Ligand SMILES: *[C@@H]1O[C@H](CO)[C@@H](O[C@@H]2O[C@H](CO)[C@@H](O[C@@H]3O[C@H](CO)[C@@H](O)[C@H](O[C@H]4O[C@H](CO)[C@@H](O)[C@H](O)[C@@H]4O)[C@@H]3O)[C@H](O)[C@H]2NC(C)=O)[C@H](O)[C@H]1NC(C)=O
C-alpha cells in the first residue's frame with residue numbers, strides 16, 4: 570500500500586471496487602479495465618459529487634452500470650461503499666444473493682438489480698434502507714413469500730416482474746405510497762386483498778400472468794387518480810363491479826385471458842382519458858353497446874358476444890353453470 | 905404515450921438513457937449530480 574486519496578471516505582470505495590473488480594468473472598465491454606489507480610472519480614460507471622455532509626469533500630455518490638453485460642457476484646466488501654444512493658446494475662449477468670453487508674448503505678435511494686441472475690429468497694436487507702424510493706427486482710429468480718413489511722415503507726415504485734413468488738399478496742398493500750407496482754409474470758396465489766383503495770396515490774399497476782383467483786374486490790374504485798390497471802392472463806372469476814366508475818383518471822385497462830363472467834357496464838367505459846380497453850378472451854354475457862365505435866380502442870375477441878364476431882363456440886361459452894360466482898359469501902369479495 | 909408499468913416487462917429498457925443521472929432527474933447533465941432529484945413521482949418524469 571503506497572497510495573493516498575483526497576479523503577478517507579473514497580479510500581474505502583477503492584477497497585470495495587477493487588475487491589468487487591476481483592469478483593468480475595466476465596466483462597465483454599471491457600468497462601472494468603479502467604478500474605485501476607486512486608483517481609476513482611474517473612472510473613467508468615462510478616460518479617462523484619460534493620458530499621451532502623460537507624461540500625468541501627467529494628465522495629462517490631452513485632454507481633451506474635447500465636446494460637454492459639457484466640458477470641460475477643456482489644462480495645460483502647461493498648459495505649465500505651457508503652453514501653451511494655443510485656445503484657444501476659441492470660441487464661448484466663450478475664449472480665449470488667444480495668450481501669447482508671449492503672445494509673450499511675443507509676443513503677440508498679434507488680436500487681436497480683433488474684435483469685440479473687440473482688437467485689435468493691426476498692432480499693430482507695433491501696428493507697433496512699430508509700431512503701429507498703425506487704426498487705426493481707424484475708427478471709430475477711427470487712423465491713418464496715413477499716414480506717408484508719415492504720409496503721409499510723414509504724416507497725414510490727416496486728417492480729417484481731418475471732420472478733418466482735409463491736405466496737399471496739399481503740394485506741399491507743394498502744399502506745404503500747408506491748406510485749407504481751408490478752406483479753407481472755409471477756406465481757402469486759390467493760385473492761387480491763380488499764385494502765387497495767387505501768392508496769390514494771397509486772398511478773400504475775399490473776397483474777399480467779399470475780395464478781391469482783377470486784372475485785374482484787370492489788374496493789378498487791377508490792383509486793380516483795389511477796392510470797394503468799391490468800389483470801391479464803389471470804384466473805379471476807366473477808362479474809365486473811359497478812363501483813369501478815370512480816376510476817375517473819384511468820387511461821388503459823386490460824382484463825384478457827381471464828374467466829370473468831357477468832355484465833359489462835356502459836357507465837365508466839366512456840371516459841375521455843381511457844384508451845385501449847381490452848377485455849378479449851373472456852366470458853361476458855353482458856353487452857358492449859357503448860363500451861367498438863372508433864374514437865378509442867376496444868377488443869372483444871373470444872368474449873361470447875352473439876352480436877359481435879370472433880366469438881366462442883356456444884358449447885364452449887357457459888357449458889358449465891351459467892351462474893357466475895355469487896361474489897357474496899366469498900372470502901375475497903365480502904361476507 | 906409513455907407508460908413505465910408496461911415498459912417494465914422489457915428487461916432491457918431503462919427509465920433514463922443518459923447514464924449516471926438519477927432516474928428521477930433524467931434531464932441535461934450540466935453537472936451530472938447523482939444527488940439531485942427533479943421529479944417526485946415516476947410517472948410524470950419518464951425521460
Ligand atoms: C392495446 O392493448 C393490447 C392488450 O394489452 C396490446 O396487445 C398486446 O401487445 C403486447 C406488446 O405490446 C403483446 O406482447 C407480446 O406478446 C407476444 C406473444 O403474443 C410475446 O411473444 C412478446 O414477447 C416478446 O417481446 C418482448 C418485448 O420485446 C420480449 O421481452 C420477449 O422476450 C419476447 O421476445 C410480447 O410480450 C401482447 O401479446 C398483446 N396482446 C395480445 C392479446 O396478443 C396492444 O399492443 C395495445 N395497443 C397499443 C400498445 O396501442
Ligand SMILES: *[C@@H]1O[C@H](CO)[C@@H](O)[C@H](O)[C@H]1NC(C)=O
Nearest residue numbers: 748769770771772793794945
Ligand atoms: C390523488 O388524489 C388524492 C386525493 O386528494 C391526493 O391526496 C393524492 O396526492 C393524489 N395522488 C396523485 C396526484 O397521484
